[PDB]
Design a protein around this ligand. Sequence first.
Ligand SMILES: *[C@@H]1O[C@H](CO)[C@@H](O[C@@H]2O[C@H](CO)[C@@H](O[C@@H]3O[C@H](CO[C@H]4O[C@H](CO[C@H]5O[C@H](CO)[C@@H](O)[C@H](O)[C@@H]5O)[C@@H](O)[C@H](O[C@H]5O[C@H](CO)[C@@H](O)[C@H](O)[C@@H]5O)[C@@H]4O)[C@@H](O)[C@H](O[C@H]4O[C@H](CO)[C@@H](O)[C@H](O)[C@@H]4O)[C@@H]3O)[C@H](O)[C@H]2NC(C)=O)[C@H](O)[C@H]1NC(C)=O
Ligand SMILES: *[C@@H]1O[C@H](CO)[C@@H](O[C@@H]2O[C@H](CO)[C@@H](O[C@@H]3O[C@H](CO[C@H]4O[C@H](CO[C@H]5O[C@H](CO)[C@@H](O)[C@H](O)[C@@H]5O)[C@@H](O)[C@H](O[C@H]5O[C@H](CO)[C@@H](O)[C@H](O)[C@@H]5O)[C@@H]4O)[C@@H](O)[C@H](O[C@H]4O[C@H](CO)[C@@H](O)[C@H](O)[C@@H]4O)[C@@H]3O)[C@H](O)[C@H]2NC(C)=O)[C@H](O)[C@H]1NC(C)=O
Ligand SMILES: *[C@H]1O[C@H](CO)[C@@H](O[C@@H]2O[C@H](CO)[C@@H](O[C@@H]3O[C@H](CO[C@H]4O[C@H](CO[C@H]5O[C@H](CO)[C@@H](O)[C@H](O)[C@@H]5O)[C@@H](O)[C@H](O[C@H]5O[C@H](CO)[C@@H](O)[C@H](O)[C@@H]5O)[C@@H]4O)[C@@H](O)[C@H](O[C@H]4O[C@H](CO)[C@@H](O)[C@H](O)[C@@H]4O)[C@@H]3O)[C@H](O)[C@H]2NC(C)=O)[C@H](O)[C@H]1NC(C)=O
Ligand SMILES: *[C@@H]1O[C@H](CO)[C@@H](O[C@@H]2O[C@H](CO)[C@@H](O[C@@H]3O[C@H](CO[C@H]4O[C@H](CO)[C@@H](O)[C@H](O[C@H]5O[C@H](CO)[C@@H](O)[C@H](O)[C@@H]5O)[C@@H]4O)[C@@H](O)[C@H](O[C@H]4O[C@H](CO)[C@@H](O)[C@H](O)[C@@H]4O)[C@@H]3O)[C@H](O)[C@H]2NC(C)=O)[C@H](O)[C@H]1NC(C)=O
Ligand SMILES: *[C@@H]1O[C@H](CO)[C@@H](O[C@@H]2O[C@H](CO)[C@@H](O[C@@H]3O[C@H](CO[C@H]4O[C@H](CO)[C@@H](O)[C@H](O[C@H]5O[C@H](CO)[C@@H](O)[C@H](O)[C@@H]5O)[C@@H]4O)[C@@H](O)[C@H](O[C@H]4O[C@H](CO)[C@@H](O)[C@H](O)[C@@H]4O)[C@@H]3O)[C@H](O)[C@H]2NC(C)=O)[C@H](O)[C@H]1NC(C)=O
Ligand SMILES: *[C@@H]1O[C@H](CO)[C@@H](O[C@@H]2O[C@H](CO)[C@@H](O[C@@H]3O[C@H](CO)[C@@H](O)[C@H](O[C@H]4O[C@H](CO)[C@@H](O)[C@H](O)[C@@H]4O)[C@@H]3O)[C@H](O)[C@H]2NC(C)=O)[C@H](O)[C@H]1NC(C)=O
Ligand SMILES: *[C@@H]1O[C@H](CO)[C@@H](O[C@@H]2O[C@H](CO)[C@@H](O[C@@H]3O[C@H](CO)[C@@H](O)[C@H](O[C@H]4O[C@H](CO)[C@@H](O)[C@H](O)[C@@H]4O)[C@@H]3O)[C@H](O)[C@H]2NC(C)=O)[C@H](O)[C@H]1NC(C)=O
Ligand SMILES: *[C@@H]1O[C@H](CO)[C@@H](O[C@@H]2O[C@H](CO)[C@@H](O[C@@H]3O[C@H](CO)[C@@H](O)[C@H](O)[C@@H]3O)[C@H](O)[C@H]2NC(C)=O)[C@H](O)[C@H]1NC(C)=O
Ligand SMILES: *[C@@H]1O[C@H](CO)[C@@H](O)[C@H](O)[C@H]1NC(C)=O
Length: 1171
Amino acid sequence: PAFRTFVASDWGLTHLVVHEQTGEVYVGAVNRIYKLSGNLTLLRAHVTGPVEDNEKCYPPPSVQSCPHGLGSTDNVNKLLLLDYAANRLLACGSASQGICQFLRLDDLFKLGEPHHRKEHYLSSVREAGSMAGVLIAGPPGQGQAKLFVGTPIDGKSEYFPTLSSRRLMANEEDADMFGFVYQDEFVSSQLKIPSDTLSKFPAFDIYYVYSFRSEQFVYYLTLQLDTQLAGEHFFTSKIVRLCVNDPKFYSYVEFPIGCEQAGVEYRLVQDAYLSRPGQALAKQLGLAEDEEVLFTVFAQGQKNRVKPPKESALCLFTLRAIKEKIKERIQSCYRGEGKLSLPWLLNKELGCINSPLQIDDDFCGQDFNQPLGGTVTIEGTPLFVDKEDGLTAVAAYDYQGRTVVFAGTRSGRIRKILVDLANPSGRPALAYESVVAQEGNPILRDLVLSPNRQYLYAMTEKQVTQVPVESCVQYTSCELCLGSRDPHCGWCVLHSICSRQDACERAEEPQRFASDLLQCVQLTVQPRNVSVTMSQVPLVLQAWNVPDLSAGVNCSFEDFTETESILEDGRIHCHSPSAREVAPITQGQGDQRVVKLYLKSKETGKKFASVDFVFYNCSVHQSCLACVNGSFPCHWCKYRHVCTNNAADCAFLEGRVNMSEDCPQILPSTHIYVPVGVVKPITLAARNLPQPQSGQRGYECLFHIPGSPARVTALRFNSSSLQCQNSSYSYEGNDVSDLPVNLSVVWNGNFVIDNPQNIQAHLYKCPALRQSCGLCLKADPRFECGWCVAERRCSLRHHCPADSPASWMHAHHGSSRCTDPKILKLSPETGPRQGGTRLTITGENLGLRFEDVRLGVHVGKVLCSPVESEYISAEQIVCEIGDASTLRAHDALVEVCVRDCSLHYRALSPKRFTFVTPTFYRVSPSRGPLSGGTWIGIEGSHLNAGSDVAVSIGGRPCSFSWRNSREIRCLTPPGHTPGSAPIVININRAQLSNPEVKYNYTEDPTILRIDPEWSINSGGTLLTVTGTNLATVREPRIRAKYGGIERENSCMVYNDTTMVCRAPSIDNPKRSPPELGERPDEIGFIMDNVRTLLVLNSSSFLYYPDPVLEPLSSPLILKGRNLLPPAPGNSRLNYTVLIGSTPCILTVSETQLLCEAPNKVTVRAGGFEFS
Ligand SMILES: *[C@@H]1O[C@H](CO)[C@@H](O[C@@H]2O[C@H](CO)[C@@H](O[C@@H]3O[C@H](CO[C@H]4O[C@H](CO[C@H]5O[C@H](CO)[C@@H](O)[C@H](O)[C@@H]5O)[C@@H](O)[C@H](O[C@H]5O[C@H](CO)[C@@H](O)[C@H](O)[C@@H]5O)[C@@H]4O)[C@@H](O)[C@H](O[C@H]4O[C@H](CO)[C@@H](O)[C@H](O)[C@@H]4O)[C@@H]3O)[C@H](O)[C@H]2NC(C)=O)[C@H](O)[C@H]1NC(C)=O
Ligand SMILES: *[C@@H]1O[C@H](CO)[C@@H](O[C@@H]2O[C@H](CO)[C@@H](O[C@@H]3O[C@H](CO[C@H]4O[C@H](CO[C@H]5O[C@H](CO)[C@@H](O)[C@H](O)[C@@H]5O)[C@@H](O)[C@H](O[C@H]5O[C@H](CO)[C@@H](O)[C@H](O)[C@@H]5O)[C@@H]4O)[C@@H](O)[C@H](O[C@H]4O[C@H](CO)[C@@H](O)[C@H](O)[C@@H]4O)[C@@H]3O)[C@H](O)[C@H]2NC(C)=O)[C@H](O)[C@H]1NC(C)=O
Ligand SMILES: *[C@H]1O[C@H](CO)[C@@H](O[C@@H]2O[C@H](CO)[C@@H](O[C@@H]3O[C@H](CO[C@H]4O[C@H](CO[C@H]5O[C@H](CO)[C@@H](O)[C@H](O)[C@@H]5O)[C@@H](O)[C@H](O[C@H]5O[C@H](CO)[C@@H](O)[C@H](O)[C@@H]5O)[C@@H]4O)[C@@H](O)[C@H](O[C@H]4O[C@H](CO)[C@@H](O)[C@H](O)[C@@H]4O)[C@@H]3O)[C@H](O)[C@H]2NC(C)=O)[C@H](O)[C@H]1NC(C)=O
Ligand SMILES: *[C@@H]1O[C@H](CO)[C@@H](O[C@@H]2O[C@H](CO)[C@@H](O[C@@H]3O[C@H](CO[C@H]4O[C@H](CO)[C@@H](O)[C@H](O[C@H]5O[C@H](CO)[C@@H](O)[C@H](O)[C@@H]5O)[C@@H]4O)[C@@H](O)[C@H](O[C@H]4O[C@H](CO)[C@@H](O)[C@H](O)[C@@H]4O)[C@@H]3O)[C@H](O)[C@H]2NC(C)=O)[C@H](O)[C@H]1NC(C)=O
Ligand SMILES: *[C@@H]1O[C@H](CO)[C@@H](O[C@@H]2O[C@H](CO)[C@@H](O[C@@H]3O[C@H](CO[C@H]4O[C@H](CO)[C@@H](O)[C@H](O[C@H]5O[C@H](CO)[C@@H](O)[C@H](O)[C@@H]5O)[C@@H]4O)[C@@H](O)[C@H](O[C@H]4O[C@H](CO)[C@@H](O)[C@H](O)[C@@H]4O)[C@@H]3O)[C@H](O)[C@H]2NC(C)=O)[C@H](O)[C@H]1NC(C)=O
Ligand SMILES: *[C@@H]1O[C@H](CO)[C@@H](O[C@@H]2O[C@H](CO)[C@@H](O[C@@H]3O[C@H](CO)[C@@H](O)[C@H](O[C@H]4O[C@H](CO)[C@@H](O)[C@H](O)[C@@H]4O)[C@@H]3O)[C@H](O)[C@H]2NC(C)=O)[C@H](O)[C@H]1NC(C)=O
Ligand SMILES: *[C@@H]1O[C@H](CO)[C@@H](O[C@@H]2O[C@H](CO)[C@@H](O[C@@H]3O[C@H](CO)[C@@H](O)[C@H](O[C@H]4O[C@H](CO)[C@@H](O)[C@H](O)[C@@H]4O)[C@@H]3O)[C@H](O)[C@H]2NC(C)=O)[C@H](O)[C@H]1NC(C)=O
Ligand SMILES: *[C@@H]1O[C@H](CO)[C@@H](O[C@@H]2O[C@H](CO)[C@@H](O[C@@H]3O[C@H](CO)[C@@H](O)[C@H](O)[C@@H]3O)[C@H](O)[C@H]2NC(C)=O)[C@H](O)[C@H]1NC(C)=O
Ligand SMILES: *[C@@H]1O[C@H](CO)[C@@H](O)[C@H](O)[C@H]1NC(C)=O
């Protein structure tokens, strides 16, 4: 399927609304207002735009001449409101001091556009969506239609009211339009900004986000400025209310609003949506049917209303609960308690006047204690929190009780949330996510469900998108359908599709529609496994949770065949396909084919229920073991040497194998030893070896040697023993002494007998791997291979002459001392005098038992105790050296005495082991942060000695890296308390100290300010960073996370407080920063192990896009977009235009580059380059 869509050809869009009768969609935009069909085809386009004008001008040029220069500017649709009563559309713009338009409902015919009087002007403000309001009407002749409307003011306090109650006459040409409901010289149905409050706080302003009529009132969710929170701008999100029938404006109330999630504040409204909850949420939230509810979206903190944070939270307010907070607050001021507390309105705080009254929800305000504020900020019930992708918009609706919530994202995605706090579940769960403008066009607050409530029109900066509330057809299986949980979806069993109740034909009937996973179709077949050779087999089918199929059913194994079935009891009876049909499937897939046997219903003609059905083919098994000891019923024919399902297909009666133990198989004996180049027979045992029959040859042994494969014919003595005949074997290499070889026993040329234990023949050569007595007697007693004195080499008795009765020596049981031990080399060459070192000696002709080498090892005089486990016989001894403090020598040769220190049986090391006492004198940072993670460089002498090393700062262990004669490098642990700390290094049994060389733990550095608060996509600009203890980190660097990519860059420390840093590149071909600017996912600094500095919560650092540049005595002029960003303060890019190597003196402008040239051209700005 494809998502129905309307694209914004030229400009940005601002507002959308749906006509409750027609389903026509009206769309407010900059310079345009469109009418669209339900499926988003363009129906009519109104030009409202580019108008010659100027914001500074009061009454706009039409009425009076203005001395300020005029220019063609864009007219932003600020507001849009459906007036069904007068068959039209209020289409309120800007850029004319905010004059309002009336477009006729069905053709967009301008009925009127009043702009003579001062009330016809709404606000200079050119910002979209900072305005809102509601249209409310009575019948013609009675109290006429009124408009309640909030807008920002931009400091034009005396020109416009922020909130107003205005008149809507039936004639659009009538001059009375947008006049106040009741005007007096004392009090008018409007609320102005006081001049005193603008003098005190310079640019205070009220931005109106959402607005709705409820019962008899009118609410507004608003954003205001710092007035008890001159300084900087911080915003407070509040609710406002009025009685509809209060011309005096005395009912005004104003409570701060937000919500908290695990100690994180969310105080900035982005959107809201009044709705119903339906039976579900209502009940367990404790409400009556017609009781209302308010879904909202808030961003984290109270910072940057112009560009809020990603961190966003969807909260909830029951209107009964806000009504109680307002009633509770009024029944409180009418007790005379405290002040009114409304900073921006009343600068000098007037007091609450006590009085006896019946305080009701019907209370519409009175003369004294007047317009009043709120102290207790109203907290909301949180539902879902996005941390990587900011929520932007919301809607909700009642579906068959269950409450579905819709949530726009900064990405251009919509979430479909069942709110389940009042529902059984642990917390409200996301059901589904969907895509609109994937590239990252944010969704806008104006997000309306259709009248039929089948779709949801989702608006972006650049496109409207008809997203269906229900799209269950994406669900392929009963198990996934009812698994998604998004409540519109059910499994329409007989159609085998997923959709709503009203879409499944005959759903009302028994078992025809499934709503809980337990209703899903469950199927089983009695003969699950059927052989390829069988045909038309009777199968019984048990199925549960299925409607009456007396309509008829067919069995289809897949889209290959289809057999008719008859019904009896609670079971279905159909037949397997014919052999003629079965094999066309199984051909190719060999061993077996699992196939999804369906049921095709006669009523629908769609497959719905399935099972795993197995088609097994015995024949493809090419050994007895696979055939019988497999998973299936298969018979093996000893004599034909073929696997098949039919007993009769076997050679004859006494050659059928049905049991795995009766297989023709080779049994193991104690290992098959085969010397190279020696004539030997190889007797084998086995079981049930076949008597070769008519036209069948005898047995052979085939040896799979990569060098040479030998074919030797054999004799089968009985059903249980074989023997390959006298022959010699070889391999070409002399590289490995012991080579195990795969052997296959064949008869009649190609019939290979089964080898389960996979018995091998070991071809051994008397050593091509061992030129030392110790190595030979080390190897198997099986080989018979032994060491022969005279030759100075090792071979069997067979291959070595007996000149003496004891000239050939073999390790009898290992009780064989071995001559002329030799040491090749030993590791650690140096060691500490205290000992404890593990000496690692590697020789060639050592002793064959441990208990003879133990006590034999010595380092000069020093007794060395050898280790059992780490000792590899006659190749290697691992030995632990004892205390060498008392030794006079500085270095000594190593000695091994095999068992006795006999004159021929002693070895002495070619180079000698050295004793030292390592010392240290300096550390190369002597200071570091308390969190630790500092790269320490301990300088000294003999530091590479011994085996183990352990460095302890304050008793706590250092993470070791590498060791040297002169240096030890390790990474510091966290310190307990800041200040001087002892450094203890222990090498084996030597523990060396120095109280003159200490390590000073410092208080963790802090980051305060980065100065410019921005950079470009490729980075590379200077950043003037300030903080504390910055000299205590030697190599600090900046870190930034943009999208799925993390990047780093260098810093240069100057003071303990100052640092210059080069901004990190975020160059991503997936995302590019917008012209407006964008915060990174994360920004911080890498400073050792101080991890709180890796991620900066309070940071407002922005990233702008890299410059766009156009290629091919008079000066150089280089044109292009994005040359200068809208940045705070002075701070701009240090551009340098160069020619081969020579820089020029240039003046930089927003679209052009004014270099100067005397007549290969490169432009640089930070880490950016272009030609
Ligand atoms: C269940 O599975 C079985 C087995 O997997 C399968 O039966 C196979 O059916 C296909 C037909 O599509 C056969 O494949 C074709 O074979 C053509 C020639 O067959 C000759 O060679 C056979 C192979 O001998 C090998 O196997 C034996 C024993 O393991 C081994 O000792 C040998 O060394 C050798 O490797 C041989 O079995 C066969 O003799 C059969 O037929 C006679 C007469 O009916 C019967 O008496 C025997 O008992 C025996 O069953 C015969 O001599 C060949 O033309 C063709 O090859 C061409 O096409 C391919 C692919 O395009 C090209 O790559 C190639 O270059 C050729 O141009 C093709 O391979 C296959 O031989 C059957 N398998 C067997 C064991 O016979 C069925 O799908 C399933 N059974 C059912 C009932 O559905
Ligand atoms: C051809 O088929 C055969 C036979 O089916 C198959 O044989 C396997 O051989 C390996 C050896 O390589 C066996 O591994 C051994 O396991 C020994 C313990 O066996 C007991 O426990 C088994 C596992 O118990 C779990 O699973 C079962 C069933 O799922 C469950 O009931 C239990 O609760 C538990 O979760 C169990 O399978 C087994 O029961 C078998 O035998 C009985 C009696 O015949 C029969 O009733 C069952 O039907 C079933 O076949 C039994 O209860 C373990 O002790 C052993 O290690 C020792 O023995 C060796 C040799 O004696 C010593 O050298 C060694 O030092 C140890 O002392 C070994 O690890 C494996 O269990 C066999 N598998 C089966 C299914 O029987 C081959 O794999 C097949 N070969 C080929 C080439 O296809
Ligand atoms: C440790 O070392 C560091 C430096 O390594 C040091 O930090 C600087 O210290 C020096 C003095 O030693 C200060 O420089 C003085 O600035 C005086 C005027 O200040 C104005 O101009 C500043 C510099 O402009 C440069 O940088 C900007 C931005 O990068 C750039 O656009 C320009 O092109 C230009 O190159 C400017 O930063 C500063 O703005 C500060 O103040 C505002 C508002 O209060 C604040 O919001 C900012 O955050 C910012 O801090 C301001 O506009 C100037 O008069 C003075 O010149 C005298 O001294 C020189 C040399 O001794 C004499 O030759 C001359 O006759 C003058 O008497 C000098 O240039 C600089 O302000 C510090 N930097 C910062 C960021 O604070 C630490 O102080 C050192 N610690 C010590 C000394 O213990
Ligand atoms: C291929 O397709 C076939 C479909 O027919 C599948 O065969 C079925 O396998 C399952 C197990 O894999 C069997 O369930 C078991 O049933 C036994 C009781 O068996 C007795 O009753 C059977 C039905 O009433 C009957 O068919 C049996 O008779 C057979 O055996 C005789 C003698 O060998 C033979 O002559 C006949 O021809 C029959 O073949 C027999 O009297 C039951 O004891 C099992 O429970 C045990 O195991 C479980 C799990 O470990 C354990 O929890 C219990 O405690 C208990 O120990 C088990 O339920 C089923 O009976 C088979 N159906 C038939 C018709 O034989 C087969 O699975 C498919 N093959 C593969 C590889 O998938
Ligand atoms: C281990 O590491 C710690 C931390 O690095 C060391 O402590 C630091 O010592 C340095 C020496 O280089 C100090 O700098 C000097 O500060 C003194 C005056 O110190 C006073 O002022 C400080 C800054 O305003 C202030 O932080 C101090 O207060 C601390 O102590 C109290 C009480 O214990 C505590 O309650 C506080 O919380 C503070 O922690 C203190 O009142 C000054 O004389 C020096 O000035 C010289 O240099 C300047 C500039 O060049 C020059 O103009 C002058 O003429 C003069 O020559 C110098 O600034 C630093 O303040 C200490 N930092 C911390 C965090 O304590 C500690 O010494 C190390 N141990 C060892 C054994 O070396
Ligand atoms: C404007 O939007 C409207 C709806 O808001 C829309 O017109 C509708 O199109 C649908 C199909 O997209 C039509 O619904 C049909 O109703 C008839 C019964 O009269 C059925 O026969 C149709 O069934 C067919 O289609 C099924 C699903 O694809 C098939 O399974 C089946 O085999 C049939 O072929 C179908 O349910 C309907 O006619 C109108 N709606 C109304 C109220 O008339 C249209 O897409 C948009 N039009 C424009 C000009 O933009
Ligand atoms: C449920 O199962 C039943 C029985 O298993 C099954 O009945 C089948 O119906 C089709 C007709 O749709 C029969 O096929 C016909 O057979 C004649 C010969 O007698 C053929 O000449 C025809 O084949 C032509 O048409 C085909 C399809 O267009 C072409 O592929 C082909 O090239 C020919 O031109 C004709 O289709 C078939 O014989 C029976 N099946 C059996 C096993 O007899 C039916 O499909 C199912 N019932 C229902 C109501 O769906
Ligand atoms: C000597 O014989 C050995 C053992 O028989 C051979 O090594 C291994 O042979 C087995 C066959 O039993 C291979 O195992 C296979 O594994 C896959 C797993 O995906 C499985 O699907 C197959 O059914 C099969 O069991 C295994 O690949 C193979 N080992 C290696 C490393 O390839 C060996 O090939 C023989 N030596 C020589 C030199 O041929
Ligand atoms: C060869 O084998 C036969 C029979 O096993 C035996 O008599 C003879 O000793 C063997 N010959 C040699 C040279 O090993």
